[PDB]
Symmetry: C2
Subunit: 102 residues, 2 copies
């Protein structure tokens, strides 16, 4: 079954292999061509927009509807971003607030 625990374990090891591959691509200065190979153009654009969503949610000045109109993202996308930021570990959120809100 595709929802089995053994399949979730295979997906996890495949994901960690990508993370390690990307880790060493940065060390070899090959991260830009590898990300161009592994991601579609729309996936790269979404990642850039999601950084802005994280920044504005952390800042708390703009409303979610306001966020939707400046970036062209739906309300559902904004809400899923807020869900993900809420579930993020404290150590990550603390670092993001120092980087994106300086």
């Amino acid at each position: 079954s595709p929802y089995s625990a053994a399949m979730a374990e295979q997906r996890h090891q495949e994901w960690l292999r990508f993370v390690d591959l990307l880790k060493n691509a940065y060390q070899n200065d090959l991260h830009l061509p590898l990300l161009n190979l592994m991601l579609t153009p729309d996936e790269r654009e979404a990642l850039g927009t999601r950084v802005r969503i994280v920044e504005e949610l952390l800042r708390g000045e703009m409303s979610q509807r306001e966020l939707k109109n400046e970036l062209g993202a739906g309300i559902a996308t904004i809400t899923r971003g807020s869900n993900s930021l809420k579930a993020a570990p404290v150590e990550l959120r603390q670092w993001l607030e120092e980087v994106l809100l300086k």
Copy 2:
């Protein structure tokens, strides 16, 4: 406001490079795994794990179309797009991938 413009193409490039730099620092701070969990949906993370195996098998050249669809669940359209991306990749990236993946 229209996404098809030289001004918006420049904005998309800066937003992408900002995520690239953010992820580079996360690797150096060992926050890459929670950052990637924050910025990607689980189905996107699963696809990236699968695309590594597609690249591996395309470079190896042994798996056939039925095997690629049976083992990786990748249809003909996905393999074709992955092949297109690999053909566009610079040699230096392809040299390195054949070393670390095989």
